[PDB]
Design a binder for these strands. Structure first.
Ligand SMILES: Cc1ccnc2c1NC(=O)c1cccnc1N2C1CC1
Ligand SMILES: [Mn+2]
Lengths: 555, 412
RNA sequence: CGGCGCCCG
RNA sequence: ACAGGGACUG
DNA sequence: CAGTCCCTGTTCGGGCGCC
């Protein structure tokens, strides 16, 4: 007889599959003689057993190394068993962000020892565990055994651990409503607004409750260690910060340097306000090798500079005070880049961040703002579970005009205007109705698919005509091109009539920036003009002076 | 201790592994208090990591209600139980339900908590109550009883339902009663006073047979269809003739007897848009004959039960929305318009959420089926707030669309 | 070896 | 990598 | 009809930021 610590969680196998039988795979020759002994230890503790006949099971060994150890950590490879083992609902959905934590007066960390080997494996599944690994080099053929607990590198070790531990904690917690716990791996962090000593009262009383379940809590445990260092974070009960960031000063610039660079800037951007990656990010476009050589442009360096000066002075985040409102304010940073700060009390920030993503082939500041506002709302719901007060560089009339004209359903939640320049504006509007006393340019364009060759032009009510030959082009590009001409050759006020569904779709969505130089130019001409009217008439319907410019360019 | 109707994921497909989306703290409180109380009632119970299945859940308050109703998005499960409900047991859809002067919708879903569920199936109803900021892990449950909003729940309860109702149908034969998922549709030509009385009465029926029921009226006899109509003009600019002609070209995709010939000829030279061109008589008559073909129905558009319905919504501006229901292009089963819905003039997503609900509703009263939406919205916008404005116990299917406005010409 | 988050086909 | 829409091929 | 492309916008295989 062995003994029985804590409730076991049933595990099946993907129906119609069975335990593995495998040949060994290389692992370093020196440390493994040690486990021959360590194995006998486990025999006595209940973490191992053996039987001769019943196991058609064998597993190899493949491992991962960790820095900062005063002792070596053993491993075994169940990968064949793994692939053959039922799936679980993973318990780690990702991790809480510091800015979502409430400030807690007292916060301690107990690190659970022998955590994975402290959890009973499912009785009947125990069978599938049998394994073998080289003695020192090797001499005689060998022997084998079975596992009584959660094995290293097994899938359920993490799932079942997390759940069992949680299951254990539930009754302490129900008995202690005003404590606050969080579990990451084998470490537990506990915190309260109670007084420092009675807090330590419950800290021992809990090391008690864990012991009552066979869970070890050493005294290497620290009330005196905080800040706790966790995943790039430094956490004190009063204030949090990113762990110190080292920005490369290298004279030599390879694309992998710029990569690590960018990732680092964004990670800084969660806390240090106003980080810009745009120009550094332009270098990265369409490169074959991660080891290639790239020079830095002047803009990207003036930016890298401003950023280095951002990192110069230190910074810290506050924590969330659920009693008080959440405020998120976005300032337009230009080049389709955006920044935001979320604070409650002014100038004490919970966090910052960037939204730079240029979304779409042609876009504008209203669309893009709407996007930043959505990103932030989503993030806010993840962390604080609520939506912020918006402080937005946009007049309530700017915005109203946009969302109310636009064909898509679009919305920003409750928000208030902040008059911080540059302010977001609509750079042109298309008229909703034809313009009296403007020339009417009937415009068309066509190209030939085979030759990729073509022409763009127009006819007007005034007799004015034009046709321009174009090389290496498409039907679409010519229809944009003809509308363009009609913009160029027209007065301040002009009516433009086009037959292209494509072109009309772009312009009518009022882009202020585009990937396409021709659209940028169209946009530019558009801003200059006092009034524009875009009209659509079906092709080859024998329309208007539309049949005429269609003839003119199809020739 | 009563039987349990075994249930099966139609052959080949696994249980829903679909992920739980992040919730507001508000809604997480309401869900926690509802599941702990419902666990206490043994409707649901806690589960472990051995059940690797999930259905997403959130919560809503029904229209005009300050009490929180839990809502599970069982769409994925319903897709994976489907052959079971559709192929095994069919439910005839009353064609008269739509003709009734009033139709009330009562939420009977609570009754579903009576019947047990096949112990072998329960592992597929697994749903996570999320935690804010991932401070705790999820509280995972699974449904012990017949889970609200799964298509099997209204299916399996069919016998019992037809039973409890048989007294009323027998006493009131002229009253039409239809059932779609967690909702029950009841309608009659009675004057509203006595209708509401017959409704309170039916409420009693299900009340004494052991059910609780936390206005709902619809007026299907009043539902109007929006036909396409060409403008009435005193005097015509060129531009008018052009937009007219373009529209005519579309309608001619729908009604084939349309001709643009004489209006096109009206456009003959290269003319200023705003110049005023008089209507020739031959054209005046082609146009009036067109205004005619547009008062007709469309030959050969009829509902085919086997086909999925598809519903398209266009945003027309200024609180207006147009919609069209069809199973196949250009053969439209219904066209319509909504205005001054909640959110009008301030929040588009709200209005749209409303439109999707009203449309699904007419769709259920008429064909007994929820439509597939094409939503004139960005995917992400929609996911964020659609979860915020939802008052219905069901969830239609949707996909996201971009059609800068030339079909916006479904209304002047 | 993975999870989580961005950038390129 | 996948889909929707346009337009041209007899 | 299918069968061609031209243009545009969300899922998966490369690599950096955090374990
Ligand atoms: C790393 C971590 C993750 C999640 N929560 C906590 C912690 N540890 C803390 O440093 C912490 C700090 C301040 C307040 N709560 C904290 N806690 C909460 C549990 C009391
Ligand atoms: Mn053309």
């Amino acid at each position: 007889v062995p003994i029985s610590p804590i409730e076991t969680v049933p595990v099946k196998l993907k129906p119609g599959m069975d335990g593995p039988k495998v040949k060994q795979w290389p692992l370093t020759e020196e440390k493994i003689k040690a486990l021959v002994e360590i194995c006998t230890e486990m025999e006595k503790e209940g973490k191992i057993s053996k039987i001769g006949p019943e196991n058609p099971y064998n597993t190899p060994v493949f491992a991962i190394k960790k820095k900062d150890s005063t002792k070596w950590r053993k491993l075994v490879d169940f990968r064949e068993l793994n692939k053959r083992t039922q799936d679980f609902w993973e318990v780690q959905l990702g991790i809480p962000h510091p800015a979502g934590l409430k400030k807690k007066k007292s916060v301690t960390v107990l690190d659970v020892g022998d955590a994975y080997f402290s959890v009973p494996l499912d009785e009947d599944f125990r069978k599938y565990t049998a394994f073998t690994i080289p003695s020192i080099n090797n001499e005689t053929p060998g022997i084998r055994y079975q596992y009584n607990v959660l094995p290293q590198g097994w899938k359920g070790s993490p799932a079942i651990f997390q759940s069992s531990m949680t299951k254990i904690l539930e009754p302490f917690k129900k008995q202690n409503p005003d404590i606050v716990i969080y579990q990451y791996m084998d470490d537990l962090y506990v915190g309260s607004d109670l007084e420092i000593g009675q807090h330590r009262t419950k800290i021992e009383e809990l090391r008690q409750h864990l012991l009552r379940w066979g869970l070890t809590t050493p005294d290497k445990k620290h009330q005196k260690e905080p800040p706790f260092l966790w995943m790039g974070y430094e956490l004190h009960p009063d204030k949090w910060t990113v762990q110190p960031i080292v920005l490369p000063e290298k004279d030599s610039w390879t694309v992998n340097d710029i990569c690590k660079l960018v990732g680092k800037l964004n990670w800084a951007s969660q806390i240090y306000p106003g980080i810009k990656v745009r120009q550094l990010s332009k270098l990265l476009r369409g490169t074959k090798a991660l080891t290639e050589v790239i020079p830095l442009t002047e803009e990207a360096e003036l930016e890298l500079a401003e950023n280095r000066e951002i990192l110069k002075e230190p910074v810290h985040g506050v924590y969330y005070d659920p009693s008080k409102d959440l405020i998120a304010e976005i300032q337009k940073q230009g080049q389709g880049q955006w920044t935001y700060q979320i604070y409650q009390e002014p100038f004490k920030n919970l966090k910052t961040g960037k939204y730079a993503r240029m979304r779409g082939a042609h876009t504008n500041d209203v669309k893009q703002l709407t996007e930043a506002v959505q990103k932030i709302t989503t993030e806010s719901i993840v962390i604080w579970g609520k939506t912020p007060k918006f402080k937005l560089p946009i007049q309530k009339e700017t915005w109203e005009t946009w969302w109310t004209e636009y064909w898509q359903a679009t919305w920003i939640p409750e928000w208030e205007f902040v008059n911080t320049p540059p302010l977001v504006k609509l750079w042109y509007q298309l008229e909703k109705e034809p313009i009296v006393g403007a020339e009417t340019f009937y415009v068309d364009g066509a190209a030939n698919r085979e030759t990729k060759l073509g022409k763009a032009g127009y006819v007007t009510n005034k007799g004015r005509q034009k046709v321009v030959p174009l090389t290496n082009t498409t039907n679409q590009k010519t229809e944009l091109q003809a509308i363009y001409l009609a913009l160029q050759d027209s007065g301040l006020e002009v009516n433009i009539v086009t037959n292209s569904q494509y072109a009309l779709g772009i312009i009518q969505a009022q882009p202020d920036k585009s990937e396409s130089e021709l659209v940028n130019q169209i946009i530019e001409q558009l801003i200059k003009k006092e009034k524009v009217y875009l009209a659509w008439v079906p092709a080859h319907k024998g329309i208007g002076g539309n049949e005429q410019v269609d003839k003119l360019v199809s020739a | 201790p009563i039987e349990t109707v075994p249930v099966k994921l139609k052959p080949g497909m696994d249980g829903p592994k679909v992920k739980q989306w992040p919730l507001t703290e508000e809604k997480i409180k309401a869900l926690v208090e509802i599941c702990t109380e419902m666990e206490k009632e043994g409707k649901i119970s806690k589960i472990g990591p051995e059940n690797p299945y999930n259905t997403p859940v959130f919560a809503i308050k029904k229209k005009d209600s300050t009490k929180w109703r839990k809502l599970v998005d069982f769409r994925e499960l319903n897709k994976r139980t489907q052959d079971f409900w559709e192929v095994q047991l069919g439910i005839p859809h009353p064609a008269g339900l739509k003709k009734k002067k009033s139709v009330t919708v009562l939420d009977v879903g609570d009754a579903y908590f009576s019947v047990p569920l096949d112990e072998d199936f329960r592992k597929y109803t697994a749903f996570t109550i999320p935690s804010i900021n991932n401070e705790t892990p999820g509280i995972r449950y699974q449904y012990n009883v017949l889970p609200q909003g799964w298509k099997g729940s209204p299916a399996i309860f069919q016998s019992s339902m037809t039973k409890i109702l048989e007294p009323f149908k027998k006493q009131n034969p002229d009253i039409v009663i239809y059932q779609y998922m967690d909702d029950l549709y009841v309608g009659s030509d009675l004057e509203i006073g006595q209708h509401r009385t017959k409704i309170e009465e039916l409420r009693q029926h299900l009340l004494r047979w052991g059910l609780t029921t936390p206005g709902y009226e619809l007026h299907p006899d009043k539902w109007t269809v929006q036909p396409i109509v060409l403008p009435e003009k005193d005097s015509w600019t060129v531009n008018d003739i052009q937009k007219l002609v373009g529209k005519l070209n579309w309608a001619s995709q729908i009604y084939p007897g349309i001709k643009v010939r004489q209006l096109s000829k009206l456009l003959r030279g290269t003319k200023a848009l705003t110049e005023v061109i008089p209507l020739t008589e031959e054209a005046e008559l082609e146009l009036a004959e067109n205004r005619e073909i547009l008062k007709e129905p469309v030959h050969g558009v009829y509902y085919d039960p086997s086909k999925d319905l598809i519903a398209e919504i266009q945003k027309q501006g200024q609180g207006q929305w147009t919609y069209q229901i069809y199973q196949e292009p250009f053969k439209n089963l219904k066209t319509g318009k909504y205005a001054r819905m909640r959110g009008a003039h301030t929040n588009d997503v709200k209005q749209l959420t409303e439109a999707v609900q009203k449309i699904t509703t007419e769709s259920i009263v008429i064909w007994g089926k929820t439509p597939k939406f094409k939503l004139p919205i960005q995917k992400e916008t929609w996911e964020t707030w659609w979860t915020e404005y939802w008052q219905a116990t069901w969830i239609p299917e949707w996909e996201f669309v971009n059609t800068p406005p030339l079909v916006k010409l479904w209304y002047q």
